[PDB]
Amino acid sequence: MVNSFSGYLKLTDNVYIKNADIVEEAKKVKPTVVVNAANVYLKHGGGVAGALNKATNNAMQVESDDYIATNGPLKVGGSCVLSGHNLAKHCLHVVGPNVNKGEDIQLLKSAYENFNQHEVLLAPLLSAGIFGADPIHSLRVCVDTVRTNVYLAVFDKNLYDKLVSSFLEM
């Protein structure tokens, strides 16, 4: 069954969260859309991007390279829709700002606005990990910006517990 999400807490009308590996979730859920926490050249070197691409045996990277050759790099805050290969029907590759490289944190709102083009998404938090944004801030921007249905997979149990306790005790 498509979009078979289970095990999430519902934080808002739009936003759900689970302590999960987004690759394992995408295999179970069969989402119409999985979000990649991409960079502007769609180089899936590690993090969520690397994990999603690894699950596609590099098909995602080859398709991404072709997209970039034909269309040029994305903008920070931008997105493109490509195949979800064996994980999803579509992968929405979204570029959040890398505040470790001095990109404007205000583009995290632009980045999450891309989600609103899809009714239902499985997604990571944006601009976490090596992109350097505070995940609590990222979740706040997500809930303030996304208006459809987003199922967030947070891999790290400690981070998950911190996000949930922070959000629900606000």
Ligand SMILES: Nc1nc2c(ncn2[C@@H]2O[C@H](COP(=O)(O)O)[C@@H](O)[C@H]2O)c(=O)[nH]1
């Ligand atoms: N493209 C990309 N590379 C990442 C991401 N997170 C980590 N990396 C890279 O992936 C490699 C392994 O990182 P680790 O798995 O230890 O976090 C390192 O080269 C690191 O810079 C990410 O979200 N995107």
